[PDB]
UniProtKB/Swiss-Prot annotation, chains A, B:
Function as written in the Swiss-Prot or TrEMBL entry: Chaperone necessary for the incorporation of Rieske iron-sulfur protein RIP1 into the mitochondrial respiratory chain complex III.
Residues binding ATP: G177, P178, P179, G180, S181, G182, K183, T184
Source organism of this protein record: Saccharomyces cerevisiae (strain ATCC 204508 / S288c) (Baker's yeast)
Topology relative to the membrane: Single-pass membrane protein
Shown segment, full-protein numbering: 84 to 449 of 456
Protein name: Mitochondrial chaperone BCS1
The keyword rRNA-binding appears for this protein: no
Family: Belongs to the AAA ATPase family. BCS1 subfamily.
Principal localisation: mitochondrion
EC number, UniProt record: 3.6.1.-
Length: 334, 334
C-alpha cells in the first residue's frame, strides 16, 4: 500500500474535503426569508472512519482521523488528518488528483485585496476584505491607464537588471492632481490587478521607518498626502526601505509644491480634471449602448464647466440611475 | 450502519435535544409564587448512554457521549456529541429531520436586536437584548414610512449594479428634525425589520475611523447628533468606510446647520412635529376602535398647539391609559 498524509493544518485540507463532497465534510443549511435577511448554519460530517471513492478506476481508500489528545490552536479543534491509500503502483496519481481539485477550487475563489493599516509602529489588518475594483471600472485620461500598467509590468520583470548592477530593486510613483480625480480608485484597481495588498498609510518619523521596513508579503505601499511634511526624516526613511523583492510606493498629493531623484520618486504623472473622453467613457460605462445620448450630453457639458471632476460625475450619474433623460437636465445645471 | 455526528459546539446541538425532548435533555423546574417573583432551576439529563426513537418507521438509534478528558471553554463543560445511527439506505433522512426540527425551533424563537456600543476604539455589547419594536408601532408622517422602507429594499438588491460599476456598496441617510420626533424609534424599528444590530455611536477622530472599519456582521451604523462636529476627519473617515456587504449609516440631527454629496449622505428626509394624521393614528393605536372620540380629540388639539410632538403624545396618552375620557380633558390643556 501507499500513503499520502494531508494534515488539518495545511490549506489544501479544506479544499480536498470540498472536492470530495462534490464527487459523484461541511454541511451548511442556509435559509433566506422573505427579506434579504439570512439564517444560515453549518455542521461538519467528516467521520473518524474510512470511506471509499473511485476516481478513474482506482478504488481509493480514504481515512480521516482526529487526535484524542492534541488540540490545534489555529482553529481551536483537535488535530485532524486525511489519509488516501490505493494500488501501490499509482500512488503518483494522488498529486495529480489534488492538483486538479485545487485548480477547480481556485477557479471559483476570486480574491479580495485586504487593506493593512498603521497601528503605532506595526501594521494591522483593517476593513474586512474589500472586493476587486476591476481596472476597466476606473476611467481616467486616454493614455495614462496604459503608461503605468506597462512601466510596472517592466519593473516586475527587471530583477536581474537591477540586481546585477547592485542597486536596490524598488520604485516610486507620484500621482498628483486636484482632489477627487480618481487616484485612490486607480491605485486600488491596480493592486487588485496584481492581487497585492494595500498597506495604506496617511500622514512620528522614527516609527515611519519601522513601518516601511516591516511590510507584509506581496504588498504595495501607499503614501497619502505627501505635501503635509518631517522632511529630512522622510527622505532618510524612504531611501532606507528594503525588501527581498519589489517595494512599490505610490504617492498622492493634492498640490505638489530634490524628491524627484531616482531611487526616490521617478515616474510622475498628472491625473487631473475630467476630459471630454473621460465623460464619454463614464457615460458609456453607466448606460450601455445609447450612443445618441452621449454626444447630447457632451455638448451640453461643454458649457458651465469649471472644476468638473469624476467624483462629481459619479454622484450626478448614480442619482439618476437607469434614467439618462433625468441626467440630461439634472447634471447640466450642477 | 451510517453515522451523523452533531458535536456539542454546533448551534444545532441544543436545538436537536429540545426537539427530541418533545418527541412523543434539559429539565427546568420553574415556580412562580403569589408575587410575580420566580424561583426556577434547570437540570440536564442527556445520559452518556444510547436511546431509541421512531420518527417515521425508522427505529433510529441515538447515542450521546461526553469526553472524560477534554473540556470545552465556550460553555465550560466537557465535549459532548450526539450520534444518530439507523438503516443504511435512509441515512439521508437525518438532514431532513434536523431541518424540520430547526424550522420548528426557529418559528418559536423570535429575535432581539442587540445594541453594540463604543468602548474606546472597539465595539462592545451593551444593554442585554432589547425587543423588536414592530414597525407599525412607530407612527410618523403619511408617506415617509414607505419612502425609506423601499429605498433600502432596493439598496439591498443592487449589489450587482453597484459592483459592476466599481463604486463601493454603501449608503447614508439623514433623518433631521426637531428633538422628540421619533427618529431613534423608527431606526430601531427598521433594524428590527431587517434583524440587524444597531452599533450605536454618539458624539477622538482617529479612532472613529477604526470604529467605522470594524463593525460586526449584519449591522446598521447609527450616528447620533452629527451637528456637533472634527469635520474634515469626519468626512475622511466617512468616505473610508468599507465592508464586504452593505454599510448603512443613518444620521440624526436636531438642526442640520458639501456633506450632501452621494457616497456620503444621499437620502435626506425631514421628520418633524405632529400632523393631524399622526395624532389620529396614535389615538387609534392606543384605543382600538372608538372612532367617534378621535375626531373629538383632533378638533380639540387643533387649538393651542405650538410644538406638539409625538413624545408629548406618548406621555399624555400613557398617563390616561384605558381611559380616553380623561385624555380628552387632560391632554387638551398641556
Amino acid at each position: 500500500i501507499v500513503d499520502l498524509e494531508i494534515q488539518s493544518k495545511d490549506k489544501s485540507y479544506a479544499w480536498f474535503l470540498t472536492w470530495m463532497a462534490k464527487h459523484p465534510s461541511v454541511r451548511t443549511n442556509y435559509i433566506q426569508h422573505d427579506n434579504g435577511s439570512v439564517s444560515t448554519k453549518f455542521s461538519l460530517v467528516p467521520g473518524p472512519g474510512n470511506h471509499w471513492i473511485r476516481y478513474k478506476g482506482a478504488f481509493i481508500l480514504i481515512k480521516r482521523e482526529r487526535s484524542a489528545k492534541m488540540i490545534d490552536i489555529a482553529n481551536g479543534s483537535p488535530f485532524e488528518t486525511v489519509t488516501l491509500t490505493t494500488l501501490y503502483r499509482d500512488k503518483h496519481l494522488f498529486d495529480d488528483i489534488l492538483n486538479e481539485a485545487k485548480d477547480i477550487a481556485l477557479k471559483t475563489t476570486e480574491g479580495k485585496t485586504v487593506i493593512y493599516t498603521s497601528f503605532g509602529p506595526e501594521w494591522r489588518k483593517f476593513g474586512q476584505p474589500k472586493a476587486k475594483r476591476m481596472l476597466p471600472s476606473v476611467i481616467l485620461d486616454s493614455g495614462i491607464k496604459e503608461g503605468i500598467l506597462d512601466d510596472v509590468y517592466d519593473f516586475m520583470k527587471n530583477g536581474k537588471w537591477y540586481s546585477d548592477r547592485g542597486i536596490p530593486y524598488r520604485r516610486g510613483y507620484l500621482l498628483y492632481g486636484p482632489p477627487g480625480s480618481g487616484k485612490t480608485s486607480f491605485i486600488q484597481a491596480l493592486a487588485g490587478e496584481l492581487d497585492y495588498n494595500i498597506c495604506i498609510l496617511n500622514l512620528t518619523d522614527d516609527r515611519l521607518n519601522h513601518l516601511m521596513n516591516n511590510m507584509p508579503e506581496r504588498s504595495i505601499l501607499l503614501l497619502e498626502d505627501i505635501d503635509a511634511a518631517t522632511f529630512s526624516g522622510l527622505l532618510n526613511a524612504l531611501d532606507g526601505v528594503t525588501s527581498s523583492e519589489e517595494t512599490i510606493t505610490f504617492m498622492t498629493t493634492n498640490h505638489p509644491e530634490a524628491i524627484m531623484r531616482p531611487g526616490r520618486i521617478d515616474y510622475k504623472v498628472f491625473v487631473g480634471n475630467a476630459t471630454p473622453y473621460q465623460v464619454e467613457k463614464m457615460f458609456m460605462k453607466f448606460y450601455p449602448g445609447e450612443t445618441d445620448i452621449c454626444k447630447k450630453f457632451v455638448n451640453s457639458v461643454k458649457e458651465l464647466d469649471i472644476t468638473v471632476s469624476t467624483a462629481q460625475l459619479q454622484g450626478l450619474f448614480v442619482m439618476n440611475k437607469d434614467a439618462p433623460h433625468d441626467a440630461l437636465k439634472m447634471v447640466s445645471s450642477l
